[PDB]
Amino acid sequence: VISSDVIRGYVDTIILSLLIEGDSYGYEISKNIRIKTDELYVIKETTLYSAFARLEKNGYIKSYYGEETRRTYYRITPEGIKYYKQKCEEWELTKKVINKFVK
Amino acid sequence: SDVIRGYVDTIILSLLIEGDSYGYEISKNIRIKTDELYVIKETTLYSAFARLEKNGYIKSYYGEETKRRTYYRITPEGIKYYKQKCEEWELTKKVINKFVK
Ligand SMILES: [Hg+2]
Ligand SMILES: [Hg+2]
Ligand SMILES: [Hg+2]
Ligand SMILES: [Hg+2]
């Protein structure tokens, strides 16, 4: 297991990161998180679905709708790509700080 | 951040492994070591001393009265916790590095 405190800081950035690869939807995103982390991080549904809500409200992603049978898909916005890049730079600084002490 | 909250204690324990220390000196060493990138707040630092001591990870002792300075020394359990948090950090970096590029 990993730091809950750090991961809380990066949930949105991790979801944005997957959306930069391609448009996606709730179940695919959480599936992709656990698989790509080698099972080290499995995201809670409540964590995931309040993140979408926040990401949308903030204007970092947009919803759209598949065919009726309707699935909600998200696509990352230019404003969401810029938030992602800021958080990437932040992660680099965060790492630099903690690697000094935690060796 | 609330991100650094996860490793405040481990940062203090790390300095304590290099030697006994006290509040002003721990704070200065953080400033210096990070070259200003991290400066711990006085409330955060005294909270962490208090929690570390509650948890049995450090012990306080006292200098001469000149008021008396409060020193801390890491315990064997403090070292155990430190090394589990190092492993955790490496795993954390792995996870976040997977996405944040
Ligand atoms: Hg594990
Ligand atoms: Hg992928
Ligand atoms: Hg270590
Ligand atoms: Hg380690």
Quick tags:
Arc Repressor Mutant, subunit A; mainly alpha; 103 residues; homodimer; binds mercury (II) ion; three-stranded antiparallel sheet; 62% helix
Question: How would you briefly describe this protein structure?
Answer:
By secondary structure, chain A is mainly alpha-helical. Chain A has helices at 4-21, 26-36, 45-57, 78-99, and strands at residues 24-25, 61-65, 72-76. Chain A has one domain (1-103): Winged helix-like DNA-binding domain superfamily/Winged helix DNA-binding domain (Arc Repressor Mutant, subunit A, Orthogonal Bundle), CATH 1.10.10.
Q: How would you describe the oligomerization state of the chains in this entry?
A: homodimer
What is the number of strand segments of chain A? 3
Would you list the SSEs of chain A in sequence order as H and E?
HEHHEEH
Largest β sheet strand count, sense and barrel closure of chain A: 3 strands, antiparallel
State the helix count of chain A.
4
Give the tally of structural domains of chain A.
1
CATH architecture of chain A: Orthogonal Bundle
- Most extensive interface between two protein chains, with residue counts: A-B, 31 and 29 residues
CATH superfamily of chain A: Winged helix-like DNA-binding domain superfamily/Winged helix DNA-binding domain
What is the rounded Rg of chain A? Answer: 15 Å
In the CATH hierarchy, the third-tier topology of chain A is known as Arc Repressor Mutant, subunit A
Overall geometry of chain A:
globular
